[PDB]
Amino acid sequence: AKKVQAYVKLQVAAGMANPSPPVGPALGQQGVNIMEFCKAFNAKTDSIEKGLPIPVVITVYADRSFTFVTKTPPAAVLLKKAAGIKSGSGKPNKDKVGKISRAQLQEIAQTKAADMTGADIEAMTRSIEGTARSMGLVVED
Amino acid sequence: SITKDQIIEAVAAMSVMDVVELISAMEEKF
Amino acid sequence: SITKDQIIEAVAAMSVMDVVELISAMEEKF
Amino acid sequence: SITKDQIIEAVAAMSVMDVVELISAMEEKF
Amino acid sequence: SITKDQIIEAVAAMSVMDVVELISAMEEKF
Amino acid sequence: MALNLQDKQAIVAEVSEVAKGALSAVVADSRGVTVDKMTELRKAGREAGVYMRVVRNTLLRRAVEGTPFECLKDAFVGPTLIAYLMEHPGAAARLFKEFAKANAKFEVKAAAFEGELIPASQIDRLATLPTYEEAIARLMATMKEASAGKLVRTLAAVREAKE
């Protein structure tokens, strides 16, 4: 690694790659084409499923296109498919909204293997211990 | 332990026996 | 001596001794 | 005589006799 | 064989023989 | 913070990693980055862990003066900026390499490896440790004795001696 050369992260869902209405002319402008950011993305995105957040770095030089290497997704968006309601925050901690305990989201703290600055396989559980409290979801743990 | 002039002089094992003491000197491995 | 047991005395052994027994092999002969 | 047939059966000569065959191999070459 | 018998037949074993013998003795291991 | 009640703390608490210390390394880190904690702490993931600490405590007056647990020749071993490192579980091998094969790649000065405890001496790195659990180094270590160490010379009179 080095530091910073060129990279960002703006996206709404994997259910629909390279969105046209959303970001539009706001998905790379320094060596990033808009009709090419769907030939290197769905090259492995269609290898798991479509409908979940997929951020990623953007290694840029000066040779026509570019190169990227994404990783584990956010454990906050997984609360629309693996937890409860469709939304999230909205109603923070003013009235016990959804409720997730020790059991749920358990293995969701097991998906980020290499991407988890929580050496202690057990302690790394305290990290995501909040990726489901940004709206108030008491744990029945 | 420290059995000096023996664990060495056991070289009477000759070639093929040394590959026998190496095949297993890891066997069930990579 | 039997090699079957001439190995059951170094495998699960401690890596400390071995070194104090490795170099000693580079002078015995070679 | 033979060559390879007595290189497989020659696969012996403990280091006690082996190393002395490389050291005496110096008493004529290298 | 005595260590002195492996020496002669070795260095000896000609060349049209050795350079086709010893060299082959290198297509076994190492 | 806190005075003596806190000073004494950083001492004994970490100086336990000296009495019962596996290995030992003293590396300054002038110009260190965060990757500094994204390395010795990253390699702690799938090949190490919370079994390693490099608590920069070169407070000398605290670190050095704080080592009554027999570590002589150290009244010198504690110069300028420092970042000691110690082990509790595991062997006393590898560790030296995490530094030797990192700082060697720029990564700030490496105190030229001033050496630390265990044998208790001075400066001039070694590496007879990380060769451990690499048993196959003890395997070929026999150089096939009869074989290889032979097929390398006793059969070099043909590919290098026929003129």
**CA atoms within 13 A of residue F67's CA, in its CB half-sphere:** 25
A100 contacts A132 by C-beta, under 8 angstroms? yes
Helix (H) or strand (E) run with residue A8 in it: strand A7-8
| One-letter amino acid for residue A11 of the chain | Q
DSSP A134: T
User: Strands of F84-87's sheet, edge to edge?
Assistant: F25-26, F84-87, F52-53
> Quick check: E26 and F152 CB within 8 A?
no
Q: Which of A1, A116, A119 sits opposite F49 (nearest CB)?
A: A119
**Rounded alpha-carbon distances, angstroms, from residue A81 to A71, A73, A86, A108:** 19, 13, 8, 12
Q: What is the resolution of this structure in A?
A: 3.1
DSSP labels for F3-51?
Answer: SHHHHHHHHHHHHHHHHT-SS-EE---TT--SGGGTTTTTTTSTT--TT
CA-based torsion, A131, A134, A137, A140: positive or negative: positive
**Where in chain A do CATH 1.10.10.250 domains reside?**
72-141
Contacts of D14 in chain B (CB under 8 A): 9, 11-14
Min distance A2 CA to chain F CA atoms (Å) = 9
Rounded-to-integer distance, Cα A106 and Cα A108, Å: 5
> Quick check: D14 and B16 CB within 8 A?
no
F92 contacts F129 by C-beta, under 8 angstroms? yes
Compute how many other C-beta atoms are within 10 angstroms of the C-beta atom of residue A100.
20
Min distance D2 CA to chain E CA atoms (Å) = 9
| One-letter amino acid for residue B6 of the chain | Q
Compute how many other C-beta atoms are within 10 angstroms of the C-beta atom of residue A114.
9
| One-letter amino acid for residue F153 of the chain | R
Rounded-to-integer distance, Cα F146 and Cα A61, Å: 55
Q: Which of B5, B8, B15 is the mutation pick for testing D, counting most D CBs within 10 A?
A: B15
- Closest-approach residue (CA) in chain F for A121: F45
CA-based torsion, F17, F116, F54, F102: positive or negative: negative
User: Terminus-to-terminus CA distance in chain C, angstroms?
Assistant: 23
F65 contacts F30 by C-beta, under 8 angstroms? no
CA A43 to mean position of chain CA atoms? 18
F137 contacts B20 by C-beta, under 8 angstroms? no
Beta strands F52-53 and A7-8, pairing class: unpaired
- Classified as helix, coil or strand, F159 is coil
A124 contacts A116 by C-beta, under 8 angstroms? yes
- Classified as helix, coil or strand, D16 is helix
Rounded-to-integer distance, Cα A54 and Cα A56, Å: 7
Q: Which of E15, E25, E30 sits opposite F162 (nearest CB)?
A: E15
- Between residues 1 and 30 of chain B, which touch chain D (CB distance below 8 Å)? 8-9, 11-16
Among A107, A83, A109, which residue's Cα sits nearest to residue A97?
A83
- Closest-approach residue (CA) in chain F for D21: F154
CA-based R_g, chain E, Å:
10
**Rounded alpha-carbon distances, angstroms, from residue E15 to B28, C17, E28, F56, F105:** 43, 47, 19, 68, 51
Neighbours of chain F (3+ CB pairs under 8 A): A, B, C, D, E
Q: What are phi and psi of A120, to 5 degrees?
A: -55, 105
Residue holding tokens 């070169």?
F58
Q: Per residue in F90-121, is it b (16+ CB within 10 Å) or e — as a string?
A: ebbbbbbebbbebbeeebbebbebbbbbeeee
User: Terminus-to-terminus CA distance in chain B, angstroms?
Assistant: 28
DSSP E19: G
CA F21 to mean position of chain CA atoms? 12
Q: Which of F91, F93, F138 sits opposite C22 (nearest CB)?
A: F138
| One-letter amino acid for residue F44 of the chain | A
> Quick check: F50 and A1 CB within 8 A?
no
Rounded-to-integer distance, Cα A53 and Cα A55, Å: 7
Tokens of A84: 């409860």
Q: Which residues pair with F87 in a beta bridge?
A: F52
F81 contacts F30 by C-beta, under 8 angstroms? yes
Min distance D17 CA to chain C CA atoms (Å) = 11
Min distance A39 CA to chain F CA atoms (Å) = 33
Of 3.40.50.300, 1.10.10.250, 3.40.50.12780, 1.20.1440.230, which CATH number belongs to A72-141?
A: 1.10.10.250
SS3 sequence of A46-111: CCCCCCCCCCEECECCCCCCCECCCCCCCCCHHHCCCCCCCCCCCCCCCCCCCCCCCCCCCHHHCC
Tokens of F151: 């097929």
* Residues comprising chain B, all counted: 30
Burial label, C14 (beta-carbon count in 10 A; 0-12, 13-18, 19+): exposed
A117 contacts A74 by C-beta, under 8 angstroms? no
F69 contacts F86 by C-beta, under 8 angstroms? no
> Quick check: E23 and F158 CB within 8 A?
yes
**Interfacial residues of F (vs A; Cβ cutoff 8 Å):** 35, 38, 41-42, 44-46, 48-50
- Classified as helix, coil or strand, A45 is helix
- Classified as helix, coil or strand, F53 is strand
Rounded-to-integer distance, Cα D19 and Cα F156, Å: 16
- Closest-approach residue (CA) in chain F for B14: F146
Burial label, F75 (beta-carbon count in 10 A; 0-12, 13-18, 19+): exposed
Tokens of F91: 């062997």
Tokens of A58: 């953007």
Instruction: Identify the architecture of domain A1-71 in CATH.
Output: 2-Layer Sandwich (3.30)
Among A1, F154, D17, which residue's Cα sits nearest to residue B13?
D17
Compute how many other C-beta atoms are within 10 angstroms of the C-beta atom of residue F8.
14
**Where in chain A do CATH 3.30.1550.10 domains reside?**
1-71
CA F115 to mean position of chain CA atoms? 8
- Classified as helix, coil or strand, D23 is helix
